[PDB]
Design a protein around this ligand. Structure first.
Ligand code: RJX
Ligand code: RJX
Ligand code: CL
Lengths: 303, 305
C-alpha cells in the first residue's frame, strides 16, 4: 500500500555527472564514454545575440575545464550538435552505464537528477507538460542537469536542463540538442504557452486510487469518448484519444472499471469538485503519473 | 525557482542493497563493510509471527542457513547476531562500495529518502517524513522489508530507517539501524494500530516560508499571535503543538523573509479557518507538512523573490 511520486534510482546517472567551466560560466556535463555533453550556452552580452558557431570557432580545447570528482579531464576535441556541446575527452568514463538517447512526448514522465558544480544534490520525478515545459526545482548552476528513465538495465536520457522561464517553469533539450517546445537558448522575451492537464495520466492516477482502496468517486455511469472530450476541452484538459483508452486497458481489467466509466467519474469531479474529500492524499487531480508508472509502482519492477 | 518533494541521490545506498534468504522468506539487507543488516523476522514463518520467540528461532540456525546475494555473487555468512529487531550477518567480504556512513535515530517530523527494494534490487526512490504517530506513509509492496531510509547531507550517508511492516491502515512501521522500533510497534502479527495522526506544524510553517521565498504572499495577514493562543487553535485542527524550539529553528527563515514566526503562525491560523478559496500554495491545495525547516533552506534560494 501507499502511492508516492517515485523517481528511478539515480546511481547509474550520478557516475556520469561532471563540472564544465568555460571562462566565468560553470555548469553540469554528462560524461558518457569519451564525450562530455553540456548546454552550448556554456560558451556565453553574448546571450543577447549569440552566433554560437562564431563564438565556438574562437575557443580551443584547453579553454574548457572539465572536472570529474577531484580529477581534471583533458578536453581533446569539441563540436556542436543543435543546442548541445560535445567535448571529446582523453578518458572514457569507467562508470558509463548501458544507455540510449530518447526524445519523449508531452505527458511522459522522467526522473531529474538536479546537480550543482558537477555534484548531484537531489532526485525528483516530473512530467513533460503539454506546453513542453517542466515544473522543476532548479536554482542558478543547475544547467546541464539531466532527465532520464530506466528500462531494465538501460538508462534512457531524455532531457538536459537549459533555462528557467519567467513563470518559474523550466525549458531544455533532448540529448541531441533539440529543444522541447518553441524555446531558444538566449536572453530574449520567451514565455510558456497556456498549459493543459494530462487526461490519460489523471485517469491512471484514479485507477491507482481504486487499487489502493479509494472508491468514493465511482459512479454507475458511463460516457461516450466524444461527450467526454467536449466536457474535458471546457476544463483545459488534453483530448483523450482511442490510443489512451487502449493504454488504460490493463488497469481497466484489473479494477473492473471500464475506461469510459472512469471518464464519467472524472467528468463529475470536474463539474462538482471533491466536496471536501481527497484522493490519495491530494485535493487536486494529479496528472504526473502515466499508466505505466501506475502499473510499475503497483507491481514492484526493479533495476 | 520551483519547489518539489526532492529525495537525495540514491547511488551510495544502491551499492549496499543485497537479498537475504532464510528458508522460504526472501527480503532486503544492507551490506556495509563485512556486515549485512536485515529485519530479524526473516527467520520467521507467517505462523511464527503471532508470538515469535526470536532467541529460540535464532539458536536453531547456523551460518549456512542464511543465503546472501549481492548482484549475481553469493556472499558467505561467517557469523550472526541479533541486536534488538535487527539481524546482523557477518559476511566474508567487505562491501567495496561502502560509503562514509552513520546510524542516526530521527525524531517525528524529520524527513528522509527511501530506496524501495525487492529481491535486493532497488526499484524506486521517494521522500517522506516520520509522522508524529511514528509511522511513515510509504509506498511498499510484499518483499520490500529491509528497504532503508536515509539522508545524505555532505558526503556521509546517515541511515535512519529500515522497513519492517505494513499496518492495517496501509501505513508503515520500522526500526532505526540499531533495531529499535519507532513507535509502540512490535515485529509480531498482533493487533496494533497506528495512533491518531497529526499535522507537523513546524514543517507547514517552513513550507509557508518557502512559498514566500518563491514569491507568494496571498495568505499573509496583518495579525500576530501569542504561542499559547496559536497552540489552542492548532490543536483543534489536529496540528502538533508548536514549541519554543520550533520557533527558534524557524529563526533563519524569519530573518530571510522579514516575517516573524508568530506573524506566520497568525497566517496559518487564518488558513486553517478559511481554507484556500480556490487558490494553491506552491502547486498544492492542501497545507504540506513533509518539508522541514532544514529541507526548505537546502532547496530554496537564499534570495527571496
Ligand atoms: O535560465 C538560466 C540561464 C539562461 C538565460 C538565458 C538563456 C539560457 Cl538558455 C539560459 N539559468 C537558470 C536555470 N534554471 C534555474 C535558474 C534559476 C535562477 C536563475 C538566475 O540566475 O536567477 C537562473 C536559472
Ligand atoms: O508486513 C509485512 C510482513 C510482516 C507481517 C507481520 C509482521 C511483520 Cl514484522 C512483518 N510485509 C509488508 C511490508 N510492507 C508492505 C507490505 C505490503 C503488502 C504486503 C502483503 O503481504 O500483501 C506485505 C507488506
Ligand atoms: Cl531528527
Amino acid at each position: 500500500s501507499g502511492f508516492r511520486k517515485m523517481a528511478f534510482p539515480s546511481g547509474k546517472v550520478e557516475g556520469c555527472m561532471v563540472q564544465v567551466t568555460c571562462g566565468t560560466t560553470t555548469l553540469n556535463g554528462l560524461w558518457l564514454d569519451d564525450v562530455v555533453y553540456c548546454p552550448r550556452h556554456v560558451i556565453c552580452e553574448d546571450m543577447l545575440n549569440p552566433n554560437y558557431e562564431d563564438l565556438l570557432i574562437r575557443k580551443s580545447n584547453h579553454n574548457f575545464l572539465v572536472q570529474a570528482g577531484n580529477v581534471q579531464l583533458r578536453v581533446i576535441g569539441h563540436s556542436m550538435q543543435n543546442c548541445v556541446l560535445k567535448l571529446k575527452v582523453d578518458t572514457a568514463n569507467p562508470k558509463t552505464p548501458k544507455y540510449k538517447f530518447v526524445r519523449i512526448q508531452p505527458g511522459q514522465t522522467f526522473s531529474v537528477l538536479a546537480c550543482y558544480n558537477g555534484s548531484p544534490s537531489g532526485v525528483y520525478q516530473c512530467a513533460m507538460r503539454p506546453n513542453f515545459t517542466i515544473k522543476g526545482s532548479f536554482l542558478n548552476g543547475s544547467c546541464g542537469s539531466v532527465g532520464f528513465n530506466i528500462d531494465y538495465d538501460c538508462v534512457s536520457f531524455c532531457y538536459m536542463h537549459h533555462m528557467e522561464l519567467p513563470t518559474g517553469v523550466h525549458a531544455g533539450t533532448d540529448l541531441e540538442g533539440n529543444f522541447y517546445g518553441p524555446f531558444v537558448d538566449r536572453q530574449t522575451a520567451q514565455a510558456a504557452g497556456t498549459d493543459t492537464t494530462i487526461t490519460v495520466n489523471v485517469l491512471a492516477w484514479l485507477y491507482a486510487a481504486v487499487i489502493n482502496g479509494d472508491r468514493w468517486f465511482l459512479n454507475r455511469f458511463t460516457t461516450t469518448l466524444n461527450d467526454f472530450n467536449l466536457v474535458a476541452m471546457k476544463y483545459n484538459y488534453e483530448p483523450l484519444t482511442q490510443d489512451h483508452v487502449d493504454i488504460l486497458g490493463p488497469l481497466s481489467a484489473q479494477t473492473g472499471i471500464a475506461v469510459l466509466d472512469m471518464c464519467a467519474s472524472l467528468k463529475e469531479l470536474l463539474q462538482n469538485g471533491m466536496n471536501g474529500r481527497t484522493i490519495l492524499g491530494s485535493a487536486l487531480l494529479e496528472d504526473e503519473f502515466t499508466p505505466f508508472d501506475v502499473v510499475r509502482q503497483c507491481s514492484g519492477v526493479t533495476f
